[PDB]
Design a protein around this ligand. Structure first.
Ligand SMILES: CC(=O)N[C@@H]1[C@@H](O)[C@H](O)[C@@H](CO)O[C@@H]1O
Ligand SMILES: CC(=O)N[C@@H]1[C@@H](O)[C@H](O)[C@@H](CO)O[C@@H]1O
Ligand SMILES: CC(=O)N[C@@H]1[C@@H](O)[C@H](O)[C@@H](CO)O[C@@H]1O
Ligand SMILES: CC(=O)N[C@@H]1[C@@H](O)[C@H](O)[C@@H](CO)O[C@H]1O
Ligand SMILES: CC(=O)N[C@@H]1[C@@H](O)[C@H](O)[C@@H](CO)O[C@H]1O
Ligand SMILES: CC(=O)N[C@@H]1[C@@H](O)[C@H](O)[C@@H](CO)O[C@H]1O
Ligand SMILES: CC(=O)N[C@@H]1[C@@H](O)[C@H](O)[C@@H](CO)O[C@H]1O
Ligand SMILES: CC(=O)N[C@@H]1[C@@H](O)[C@H](O)[C@@H](CO)O[C@H]1O
Ligand SMILES: CC(=O)N[C@@H]1[C@@H](O)[C@H](O)[C@@H](CO)O[C@H]1O
Ligand SMILES: CC(=O)N[C@@H]1[C@@H](O)[C@H](O)[C@@H](CO)O[C@H]1O
Ligand SMILES: CC(=O)N[C@@H]1[C@@H](O)[C@H](O)[C@@H](CO)O[C@H]1O
Ligand SMILES: CC(=O)N[C@@H]1[C@@H](O)[C@H](O)[C@@H](CO)O[C@H]1O
Ligand SMILES: OC[C@H]1O[C@@H](O)[C@@H](O)[C@@H](O)[C@@H]1O
Ligand SMILES: OC[C@H]1O[C@@H](O)[C@@H](O)[C@@H](O)[C@@H]1O
Ligand SMILES: OC[C@H]1O[C@@H](O)[C@@H](O)[C@@H](O)[C@@H]1O
Ligand SMILES: OC[C@H]1O[C@@H](O)[C@@H](O)[C@@H](O)[C@@H]1O
Ligand SMILES: OC[C@H]1O[C@@H](O)[C@@H](O)[C@@H](O)[C@@H]1O
Ligand SMILES: OC[C@H]1O[C@@H](O)[C@@H](O)[C@@H](O)[C@@H]1O
Lengths: 81, 53, 390, 66, 81, 390, 81, 390, 53, 53, 66, 66
């Protein structure tokens, strides 16, 4: 995935071949591990969706398919197939 | 007692004797011979009946 | 094949003549009909209103009927921290919605409770329709003025002139005869109505219905084609989730529209212009017209009736003839009685003339009722043709 | 039903009147005042005879309950 | 993943921990490599879905999230999380 | 606390008596009312219709109102190769749909074009409702026949009997008095209607509405509970894709149903049985009943009115009394005039008797209108109680 | 933060610069660690809010953004920015 | 510029005169009008009602229309342990609410279930409005009594007097003429109404509407301005959470109020006092008034009409003149017929006099209808001015 | 030619002389004097007119 | 001046003498004796009154 | 109020007519022409006497202002 | 419009009849047979005079076209 930013915050452009794998990227505050569970994750195209993966410390996830454990991150991926 | 004391006496004496009522109309129909004017008797009679005056 | 034939072949044909000299003559022009005018020592003319179209009428409103969505973005805040926002919520090309969604420890919030969420998607119109307003003025009527000569073809068009209820009196030149002057009035066609255009196919629809259509639109005087109004009409926002929300766009509405317009008067069109069947009232003056060919010789020769004399739908006949001994000349036509004593009937073709040797010169004439002699030509073989008009 | 509607209807009125005018007693009391009326039906002359000769049956029946 | 069959054809029961990784299994006709791109791939549960991953020889994939390059294969996975 | 009190405390109470001997007496039974019957030398009885319920009424149709989907499977063929199929399309537990979807080189096909696709999902109902048909017959009315004795309690139930419009004449035994014979008719309650059951709560609904409900159902006589009809009512098939298609099930409809039944008469129920407020017409014969206690001694002793004489809602009185000098005996009751010359009024409690020393024996009697002496007992202290009935 | 009391119980006046950091303060019963997760935690001002952070022993937090692990504590912070 | 001009310039002017001597004369005073009174050997006076205002009317209720919240505090208990409480729930400056919220192991409770929660916030009003009740009494009318002398200015104010329907008969002193005595009655102005004040701008509103307003309020006789009643009207308590709950206050209602009062009669005001257009009926006595200047000399000199004689709206004229040979003197005015035989017309200005040399002395007079001579002055140049009144 | 040869002769001779028609009615109205019976003349006359028999 | 010069003369002479008006009606009511026809006098008289002709 | 409405109503009309017909002068002028009318009320014969004998009061009152 | 509807209506019928009965010739032919009719209007006696005296105008007008 391409690591960029959105208003000072880290942003992940996730491609199709990354579905199902732990997303890791270094940050001043250590190594960040985001987890992508999006069922509709497809091919990067015009039909993108973009949203935030909250920071989750010792809390079970609820009503979400993306989250990081060290620093909140934005994520973007296409839905095409 | 003053409210029913005049009435209760009558409501007994009739229950003892139905008679004076039964013939009362005869005294009535032969007295005054008009409707109401002949009714006021049949009330006045059955009323003076349980009395001693 | 001959000049003036179009009007002869029409069932709706009016014959008009001026009761004065130099005066104005009134005529009524209709689509599918023609008017033939005549006057003493003046050529006979044919008039036809062939086209009535609105040119560049004001565009009222553009409606989007099919769109796509891209870059859908979601933002949301925890209970207690106010309404979230996205800067694209200020970009007129996006459709956005504000909602509330449950939040809590499971999705990054300290408190359980409703939180504010917002979602935007770029809206891209892929197919739109536009309704226009036709002004009575700026309507343009096309009228053809054809000289009733009978000359042949199979290069001789009648003068075509285009006018507007705002244009001034027209002076039309007819090669060889001079000019004819005329003025017209769109004398009674309505326009609180609107003309809907769905990809080269149009309809006439009532206003307030067009204006009520639940579809994204843009004020007529636009060119951006991006800042659509009421995009939510083609967009649906699914129930939100803590951090994301889906947005889907309805499918094309071209179909819902088509099978919705059935009933309303369909309007023809071409080259982007709308066409109508107009109605005109005109007045014309012929003081500047004159006969083409005066001062020639009187054919002194022969004619062979090219083919079977024809009867028109208007109590008249069309005789084809072709010279013979002479110059491109005048023809001696004359319809008399059986005794050839007095003149009867009259010519619709006037000052009939021959331009070439072996050039069928059609001639339309009006024979009197009953019996008459059609005398074509001069003294070698003056052509006596018997005729009976029933 | 109308016939049942008016059935209680015409009865309750005509009934209470009979529960006041007559209604003195029973057995040899009812039958007597009863039987004497039936006599008036046979005799008399004038029309009321139409009501009296019926009223006897009214009484006798209530005495014929047993 | 558990390799089984469905009417003579190979069938893959894919679990959650395989999201994002190339699926390889030997077959008489050589080694088969299926590619799973299903965004909704979750935990194996009652809510399964089952469908076919077509054979694709030198053709770009279109309107699909699963395909193999040597022998068409069926795939099954749960959507739970 | 005493036998026959229930009916005395009721506002709707009818007094019936036979005008013959050994004859039938008619009575009308209603919920919330009671009927007291009397006859010469026969005990007075109380009748009450307490329950009216349908037992095991025919089940018309079971409607599924909430379901789940599992094992969703998709199959599709290329353009040109016919309609695909899945064997589970023959398994009645699945919901399936046939459609067409674009295909091409990108998904394994030689040709670009529409291809046949099919998708099935196992349908599992999680919550259903059932509508039943109540037949006038098979309805069961419960009637309690209580002896009007006045005996006490605070072990003395009236006989309870259950009948059906199809059961024969009943012979009910009343411990101590013999038997009473009666027959009833459900004399006018309608059933083209249906009774809807949504988890122990029922409603009465019209037919053809129940039968039109857009929900999966099964013929009443089922037990599999698997082969649902018209499952598509709770299932939605999303637009297909070349090789897969999603299928989602609607959410529970219990709510849509509840707030949809508001208005229709709600029907109470228990133990799975439906309850109604019935109406009965019965005829009874008392030739086999007799007074309990005849051939005893005439109490020769004393009574102390236990408490304040009570006035009922029916022109009657209830006098509590308790012996005193004697055997479990008959009581000397008698209501006379102020002069104690003739007998007036009558007893509703008949052959009133004492079972124990210090056993409040309630007695219901009807005093004449006006003044009367209530003479309870015998010659040590015959109890003269004055009474005025207004 | 300023440590004070509210009816015998410890009370924490939390300022803006403490957002995101473990709050520790000694108590007779050992060291207390409260966790503040309030998203709306801002600058201390007139608009304060005050509430209790429950004691939580081996239980996951639910419907709360403040809790301590040794002794229930009150907390107060402003929402200004 | 001259004394008595104000009334002459008014269109609404009444002329009143007493038909007796020492008697009372009635007059009606209205805003925008004036009354001129006259009597034999008495100065002519002008009366005008210029102001009608209520002074310190009783304050009925203060409504808060904008507030702020501070120190929001929450307390809650587990299921089973009763209703929680906060002592500030006893402090009248706070708004509080009691509710129930789910609780459980996740937030410190042993049992899962509903628990009691309470939240309070200090309520601080930032902008309020107040409605007052105007009593007919305590209303104060201002009346100006100006001597109709014609003297000049461009220091000579008419006496101003303020009265109340409860004040006694007034004795007003007019420098130079004595005193005038008068009494007034507010003779028919209604007050079940109320006067609403929204920051120096007021309105007259009906009662029961003012009293029904859904806004926090305080009884009129308050000064704390803290213990508001029904604060919940401007406060909203969001759904609670296990241990905290948010509370927000509505925004200012000044606007909702303004655009809500449109329609109701607006009332002017100043210095906190409300103003109205009153109506008075008064009676006055002139027995203590006398002419200023009697016992002077009869000007024996000259006058030059300062400028163009003017015609008033009341059949009268205003002649400006300025001495000339003499003391500050009486003027010889007299309107006669063309023959100077009899006296006609009359003066409205009475005992007209000159105070200074070169001091325009305006004089209002009433000429008879038709022709008349206006004779100003004496025998050097008695000023004969012709006049025609149409 | 045999179909119109009897008719065409008449349709000419009238167009030459309107007259015999104009006075025909006079011969008609004075002959037979009833409606149709007076019409058959006005046809018979104008028909025998263009004839030599 | 030519507009009011004929009128103004009258409007004076009456204001000097009310009399000729007061008796005018007497001349009127005894002359012509009908309504308007008797009014035209009372105008003609009071009008010829301030005149010398 | 009606009585007050028509009060100015019936007065303004009847008044102006009296401000034209009469209205010549005052004092010994008004009283005379006034007093003579009151004579016509006592005498005359015909009904107008109903108006004249009133009209005197109309004048005399305006002379009785003082 | 009715008046225009029947306008061509009453005219076409009455017209064709006039295009057959009369319709012989023009100029000195039409005027004569025309003028003689107008004579019958002045004279005659019987009602037809109502039609003839009109029919003249019918002819004369067609001769007055010019
Ligand atoms: C704040 C935290 O938990 N840090 C660790 C990080 O060091 C590690 O790389 C990752 C997975 O290995 O898990 C967490 O993100
Ligand atoms: C038919 C074909 O292309 N075979 C190869 C296979 O040998 C290899 O294992 C795989 C990935 O390594 O790529 C293809 O499947
Ligand atoms: C009761 C308990 O668990 N005590 C410990 C405390 O000693 C420690 O300081 C803190 C974080 O270090 O975690 C808990 O609060
Ligand atoms: C503190 C930090 O971020 N460093 C390491 C990170 O590099 C590593 O990936 C992770 C486990 O793999 O453990 C973290 O502690
Ligand atoms: C994939 C796509 O078409 N997006 C482009 C992206 O490459 C670029 O980095 C960015 C700049 O605005 O957005 C745009
Ligand atoms: C809102 C917008 O137009 N920005 C980006 C655009 O730059 C981009 O390059 C595209 C990728 O499909 O996503 C969007
Ligand atoms: C023909 C075949 O299937 N064998 C190998 C396969 O084992 C290997 O995994 C792949 C690349 O890794 O290359 C294939 O050629
Ligand atoms: C996971 C599940 O519950 N499915 C079982 C599966 O284990 C078994 O192999 C097969 C046999 O029919 O289907 C069933
Ligand atoms: C259609 C059907 O019932 N077969 C299988 C079942 O054996 C299985 O064991 C389940 C896994 O959830 O998937 C389905
Ligand atoms: C019992 C206690 O409260 N003492 C220590 C505390 O000082 C320390 O901060 C924490 C871990 O850092 O471990 C606790 O055991
Ligand atoms: C911050 C603020 O203004 N609050 C003050 C606070 O400093 C003080 O300690 C306390 C005493 O009542 O409350 C008040
Ligand atoms: C309820 C109350 O007034 N007490 C305190 C006040 O002392 C304080 O000083 C303020 C801080 O903004 O919070 C509140
Ligand atoms: O020019 C550098 C860069 O610009 C682009 C962004 O995607 C950045 O992440 C990248 O590092
Ligand atoms: O692809 C070109 C550009 O696209 C966008 C960002 O990723 C940039 O950082 C990059 O330079
Ligand atoms: O018993 C053997 C086996 O049966 C089960 C299936 O999943 C097969 O794939 C497996 O090999
Ligand atoms: O789990 C037991 C069974 O489940 C199913 C298949 O995978 C079988 O091959 C296996 O034996
Ligand atoms: O005077 C001492 C003190 O008073 C203040 C409070 O905030 C206390 O916490 C502090 O210790
Ligand atoms: O700021 C002065 C005071 O404020 C409050 C408390 O914190 C006190 O303990 C402190 O003394």
């Amino acid at each position: 995935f391409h690591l960029t930013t959105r208003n000072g915050e880290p942003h992940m452009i996730v491609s199709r071949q990354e579905k199902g794998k732990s997303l890791l990227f270094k940050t001043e505050d250590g190594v960040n591990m985001c987890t992508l569970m999006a069922m509709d994750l497809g091919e990067l195209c015009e039909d993108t969706i973009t949203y935030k993966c909250p920071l989750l410390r010792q809390n079970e996830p609820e009503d979400i398919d993306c989250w990081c454990n060290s620093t909140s991150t934005w994520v973007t991926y296409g839905t095409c197939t | 007692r003053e409210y029913t004391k005049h009435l209760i006496r009558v409501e007994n004496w009739i229950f003892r004797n139905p008679g004076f009522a039964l013939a009362a109309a005869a005294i009535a129909w032969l007295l005054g011979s008009s409707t109401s004017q002949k009714v006021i008797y049949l009330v006045m009679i059955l009323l003076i009946a349980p009395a001693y005056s | 094949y001959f000049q003036g034939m179009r009007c002869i072949g029409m069932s709706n044909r009016d014959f008009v003549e001026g009761v004065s000299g130099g005066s104005w003559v009134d005529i009524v022009l209709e689509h599918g009909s023609c008017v033939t005018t005549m006057a003493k020592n003046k050529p006979t003319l044919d008039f036809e209103l062939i086209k009535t179209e609105a040119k560049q009428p004001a565009t009222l409103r553009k409606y989007c009927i099919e769109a796509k969505l891209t870059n859908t973005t979601t933002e949301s805040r925890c209970p207690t921290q106010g309404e979230p926002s996205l800067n694209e919520e200020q970009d007129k090309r996006f459709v956005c919605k504000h909602s509330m969604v449950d939040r809590g420890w499971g999705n990054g919030c300290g408190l359980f409770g409703k939180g504010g969420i917002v979602t935007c998607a770029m809206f891209r119109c892929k197919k739109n329709m536009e309704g226009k307003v036709v002004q009575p003025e700026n309507l343009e009527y096309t009228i053809v003025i054809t000289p009733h000569s009978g000359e042949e073809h199979a290069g001789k068009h009648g003068k075509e002139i285009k006018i507007t209820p705002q244009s001034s009196i027209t002076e039309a030149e007819l090669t060889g005869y001079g000019t004819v002057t005329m003025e017209c009035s769109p004398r009674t066609l309505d326009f609180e109505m609107v003309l809907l255009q769905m990809e080269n196919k149009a309809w006439l629809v009532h206003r307030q219905w067009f204006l009520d259509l639940p579809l994204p639109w843009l004020p007529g005087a636009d060119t951006q084609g991006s800042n659509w109004i009421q995009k939510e009409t083609l967009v649906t926002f699914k129930n939100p989730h803590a951090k994301k929300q889906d947005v889907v766009v309805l499918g094309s509405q071209e179909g819902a529209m088509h099978t919705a317009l059935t009933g309303a008067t369909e309007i023809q069109m071409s080259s982007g212009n709308l066409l109508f069947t107009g109605h005109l009232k005109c007045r014309l003056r012929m003081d500047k017209l004159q006969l083409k060919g005066m001062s020639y010789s009187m054919c002194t020769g022969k004619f062979k009736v090219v083919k079977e004399i024809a009867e028109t739908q208007h109590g008249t006949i069309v005789i084809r003839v072709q010279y013979g001994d002479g110059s491109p000349c005048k023809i001696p036509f004359e319809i008399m009685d059986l005794e050839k004593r007095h003149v009867l009937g009259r010519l619709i073709t006037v000052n009939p003339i021959v331009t070439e040797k072996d050039s069928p010169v059609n001639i339309e004439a009006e024979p009197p009722f009953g019996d008459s002699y059609i005398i074509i030509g001069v003294e070698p073989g003056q052509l006596k043709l018997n005729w009976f008009k029933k | 039903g109308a016939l049942n509607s008016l059935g209680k209807g015409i009865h309750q009125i005509f009934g209470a009147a009979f529960k006041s005018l007559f209604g003195g007693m029973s057995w040899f009391s009812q039958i007597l005042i009863g039987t004497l009326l039936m006599w008036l039906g046979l005799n008399t002359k004038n029309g009321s005879i139409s009501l009296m000769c019926l009223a006897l049956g009214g009484v006798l029946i209530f005495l014929s309950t047993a």
